[PDB]
């Protein structure tokens with residue numbers, strides 16, 4: 361088939377779909393062309409051994425106002441993650457302590473260094489912002505020092521440094537702290553409202569969508585009907601000043617005035633551009649890369665930890681599993697845990713056989729929540745790294761030095777080609793809410809021209 365549209369959109373993730381949605385409301389015609397046999401991208405609900413699981417993005421925080429509006433508009437409701445009872449902290453010394461409230465049960469010294477580092481991150485985020493962090497007079501010095509070396513410059517206390525790392529390195533960028541800059545940590549902080557919001561799992565991990573985060577794409581895509589094309593990898597974009605022809609598998613050909621690349625930036629060069637994108641894009645794209653995390657799911661006949669008075673929340677910067685949370689489905693009576701193995705720790709796990717990796721991860725959950733954690737009825741690991749249409753998780757970020765050198769160019773159109781994904785977002789950077797903001801921002805740009 362061949363069609364004409366105002367706008368061809370590559371990818372039916374949140375970002376592409378929100379763009380299409382905003383475009384249609386303005387009266388422009390669209391086609392959304394999607395490689396996979398489904399919409400949603402890095403959001404996906406699936407059933408593994410008869411257990412429904414959220415394989416990808418899923419949590420909504422209170423400052424993600426673009427996503428919260430969108431849910432409302434689509435008739436979707438939220439429920440909150442269970443947080444009653446005590447959380448578990450594992451120290452660098454291997455000590456394991458139950459606690460509630462806002463800081464980790466370390467000694468008073470470490471507690472104070474932590475508070476200091478968190479205040480300093482909040483202050484830099486408030487000054488620098490998420491819209492154009494590379495623009496600030498502090499930017500260059502913060503972008504040429506790794507986050508690790510920055511923590512070293514700020515504090516002699518390793519346990520406080522590792523804990524701060526826990527929330528940004530392993531908990532957001534999913535990269536080790538020696539490999540992104542301090543400016544990138546600040547961006548991540550600014551993008552979520554403040555560093556303190558990232559520290560508090562009651563904020564950043566506040567809510568889930570009844571029916572699963574994937575319903576958001578599924579419902580946007582449904583409203584578009586036949587303008588969504590699945591099982592259609594885009595291969596080729598031919599373009600000039602006044603438009604673009606988009607070529608996809610199954611002999612799809614869309615002639616359009618503008619194209620949106622709604623794909624994460626490590627995937628831009630899966631498509632041939634004719635003529636080639638300019639030098640700046642050739643270079644900039646090579647410097648963007650996804651992190652890596654193993655999202656572990658474990659289903660038990662009851663949420664057993666609630667009986668021992670535990671929330672299900674656990675943190676330990678020294679553990680293979682650095683975080684665990686109650687992830688029980690809305691009105692499920694079966695208990696589900698979610699846990700995260702980040703970056704180089706994920707590499708090490710992936711080198712063990714499937715069976716050794718499971719036992720190792722499970723032995724780690726047991727250290728937080730006791731030996732019942734080792735006998736789940738269902739066990740699963742989200743594997744985004746293997747997916748040719750994603751290739752990592754949660755999201756992409758520049759190598760060290762990239763943010764200030766290329767940040768100004770990451771949203772800039774090339775002729776009729778626009779770029780829209782959470783990985784280039786300002787507020788909501790790397791998250792579903794960032795994908796919505798960018799899709800709407802892109803739509804809004806195309807519409808006013």
Ligand SMILES: Cc1cc2nc3c(=O)[nH]c(=O)nc-3n(C[C@H](O)[C@H](O)[C@H](O)COP(=O)(O)OP(=O)(O)OC[C@H]3O[C@@H](n4cnc5c(N)ncnc54)[C@H](O)[C@@H]3O)c2cc1C
Nearest residue numbers: 371373375395401402417418419594753781782790791792
């Ligand atoms: C394990 C994991 C857990 C997460 N947890 C959180 C969380 O709880 N909350 C939060 O907000 N976010 C979370 N995220 C991040 C969030 O899901 C992403 O930020 C967001 O969904 C990205 O949306 P997107 O539209 O920008 O890109 P994507 O969802 O990646 O969509 C891009 C789409 O493009 C398609 N595509 C790529 N190339 C082509 C091509 N050449 N032709 C056609 N189609 C193509 C892909 O198949 C894909 O559907 C998580 C992500 C992962 C990976």
